[PDB]
Amino acid sequence: EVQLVESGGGLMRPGGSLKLSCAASGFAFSRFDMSWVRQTPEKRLEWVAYIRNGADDTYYADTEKGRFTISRDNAKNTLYLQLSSLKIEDTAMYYCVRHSGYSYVIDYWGQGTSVTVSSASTTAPSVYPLAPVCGGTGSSVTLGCLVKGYFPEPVTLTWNSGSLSSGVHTFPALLQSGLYTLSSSVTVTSNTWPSQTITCNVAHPASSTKVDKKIEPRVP
Amino acid sequence: DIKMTQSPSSMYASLGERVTFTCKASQDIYSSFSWFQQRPGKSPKTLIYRANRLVDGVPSRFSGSGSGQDYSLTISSLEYEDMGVYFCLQHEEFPPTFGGGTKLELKRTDAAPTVSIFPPSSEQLTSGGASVVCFLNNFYPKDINVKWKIDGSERQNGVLNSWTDQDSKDSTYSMSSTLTLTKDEYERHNSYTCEATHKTSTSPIVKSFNRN
Ligand code: NI
Ligand code: NI
């Protein structure tokens, strides 16, 4: 049961530093070479750094002085990547990967840890319920949730704490004048709303914001 | 670094169909080559190594071939779980380099969108802003145009359009269109209209409301 679990990512200003960790389990960590790989927002994959059993035998795609440092603590079964003098274009999902043997071939990938390099401040979202237009007629009804003005990504959004997943469409977040906006729609049969409550659950961990917004009919 | 050129960049395929991706390296890489699959929302998974060897647990419908500079991945009988993005990788020379990816999606019959329009919520109006939202649900193919009209005149400034990826249950797309106004501007007009044009019909689908 090979497991690689990254952590340490987050938001950082350009010029700052960030240390990522990869907790390994399920294999003899000290006998395998390891690499870090990153995926950019454009979904491009790119090698970052590579380390063998030794602490000095490290190789980097960009060896500009003191920008990437890969290290490992074999007693803690952990791999590290120190990012320094961060640039905006270092924004990416960083993956821990295990080499199968003596070559550069990969077998297992981690789950990734998201790094955002930006000058913008963390900002909590506003959550707005979208109820149908004043009126009320049809076999089904479509409701919505608009999450506006937050930074950085991501927000998570569920309906009725996850128990309502059929008929749900969530639209990817888009940057609009420095801040993200996301929305979600849910379609249910007309006889269940508003007789049964429908609630939008929005979480923004970077600002610790958690909102549960009930959708209620418009008035008058 | 060695350049990896993957083709095509995307393709639609039917269930049970045979599909082939190719990748070309800028020099001989002696079969130090792998294929990866990235299902939607997940990290990549290694499918093939050494050009033609299957990773344990990968079904036999996947197969790789090639040598020198030219390599291929073939999926013999396409299944629903095979959708996602496929990447090639050379690891003959450091640093290993990935191809740009091939996005594989499901072909299905055309479907017209279901359109819904939402005035600004009362909570937003208290804040000083006003967003009008149009949802276009469950259409195929992906291309679609949305037009906003305010008291009859077209408005394009301030529109944000967001598509989903392909639906995992019915292979349709949905999209959200948000027109963002100031509260002052929203209150200067009465009728708001979202018009969706899609290849399934020459006439647009129209949804409107009046501020009353
Ligand atoms: Ni759906
Ligand atoms: Ni090059």
UniProtKB/TrEMBL annotation, chain A:
The keyword Signal is annotated on this UniProt entry: yes
Residue span relative to the full protein: 133 to 239 of 472
One BP term from GO: adaptive immune response
Superkingdom classification of source: Eukaryota
Segments forming domain Ig-like: 125-216
Statement: the UniProt record of this protein carries the keyword Cell inner membrane: no
Disulfide bonds listed in the record: C145-C200
Keywords per UniProt: Adaptive immunity, Immunity, Immunoglobulin, Immunoglobulin domain, Signal
Full protein name: MAb 44B1 heavy chain
Gene Ontology CC terms, in alphabetical order: immunoglobulin complex
Automatic annotation (TrEMBL), chain B:
UniProt domain Ig-like: residue ranges: 113-210
Superkingdom per UniProt: Eukaryota
Disulfide bridge partners, by residue number: C134-C194
Name listed for the protein in its UniProt record: Anti-colorectal carcinoma light chain
